[PDB]
Scaffold this active site. Structure first.
Site: not given
Length: 330
Positions: A35, A199
């Site tokens: 994770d 992004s």
């Protein structure tokens, strides 16, 4: 040194991925959920409330000659999906795909929430976010990656998640045969303890690319892709019959649909998520309504590039003095 281990989806939907981990002496192998959105290595164990174990493989520290109780240390964690676990702490030898760490903090669960109990395929989590998020008290502990870093050939690990197929986690090296073209690196903020990046924008299907900054985290422990409501609305608007259902808890779409791809930007580069990756199947057995793999982050407070996005790429988690993230098509 290096390490390399295969990671395998737990079910037909890629709800999560498990990776075999050797703990203790002799080795006890547990299948852990790697994770990058948390920083605790915790396991089902011989100490876990019996009624809360249902099929998981447990760690039994009394059977490991290298296990040592970390005196007075406890841990307690809650995840973004409302699940939770807590217990006490041992140090022991932990190996991942040939890479060995001695004295790793192995957090032993005394209590786990129902969702963990109900998932017989996940024996625990191995956190790969920054150690600042580690919940061990009163002495915070380091992640497996953090402990391994000095020994590694290069201070990196990579995530190569498969679509309905096995993939690979590598430590200490970049497998140049595992991706196409070049790796595009982008800046990371460690301020929230996550692999947080920005992004450069997105496209829906064959549509024009929208340049827009989307701050989010690279999180292998989250199944879906969670993005701003504007972005998610623009995606599902291209799917006839798709709608947001409050009763189901997100966007659903007719199972007879053909989903468009979703592209996200990494600097000047582009990663394309095929439409099939965004299909998570009937909302309930036999239903003709299917659950969407791209959902709004409006409720969460952060954007999450979960498995839906990450499995479309070869992803480099660069733990140099100034950490960065690398993305390649594959």
């Amino acid at each position: 040194s290096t390490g390399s281990a295969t990671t395998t989806p737990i079910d037909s939907l890629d709800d999560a991925y498990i990776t075999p981990v050797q703990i203790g002496t002799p080795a006890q192998t547990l299948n852990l959920d790697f994770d990058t959105g948390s920083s605790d290595l915790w396991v089902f164990s011989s100490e876990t409330t019996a009624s809360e174990v249902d099929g998981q493989t447990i760690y039994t520290p009394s059977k490991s000659t290298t296990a040592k109780l970390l005196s007075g240390a406890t841990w307690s964690i809650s995840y973004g999906d409302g699940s939770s676990s807590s217990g006490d702490v041992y140090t022991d030898t932990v190996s991942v795909g040939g890479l060995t760490v001695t004295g790793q903090a192995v957090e032993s669960a005394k209590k786990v929430s129902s969702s963990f109990t109900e998932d017989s395929t996940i024996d625990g989590l191995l956190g790969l976010a920054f150690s600042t998020l580690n919940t061990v008290s009163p002495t915070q502990q380091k992640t497996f990656f953090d402990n391994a870093k000095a020994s590694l050939d290069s201070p990196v690990f990579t995530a190569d998640l498969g679509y309905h197929a096995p993939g690979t986690y590598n430590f200490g090296f970049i497998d140049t045969t595992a991706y196409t073209g070049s790796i595009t690196y982008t800046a990371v903020s460690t301020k929230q303890g996550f692999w947080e990046w920005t992004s450069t924008g997105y496209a829906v299907g064959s549509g024009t690319f929208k340049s827009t900054s989307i701050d989010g985290i690279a999180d292998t422990g989250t199944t879906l892709l969670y993005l701003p409501a504007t972005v998610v609305s623009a995606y599902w608007a291209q799917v006839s019959g798709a709608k947001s259902s409050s009763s189901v808890g997100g966007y659903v779409f007719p199972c007879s649909a053909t989903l468009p791809s979703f592209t996200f930007g990494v600097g000047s580069a582009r990663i394309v998520i095929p439409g099939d990756y965004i299909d998570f199947g009937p909302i309930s057995t036999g239903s003709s309504s299917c659950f969407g793999g791209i959902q709004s982050s409006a409720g969460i407070g952060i954007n999450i590039f979960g498995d839906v996005a990450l499995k479309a790429a070869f992803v480099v988690f660069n733990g140099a003095t100034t950490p960065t993230l690398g993305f390649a098509s594959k």
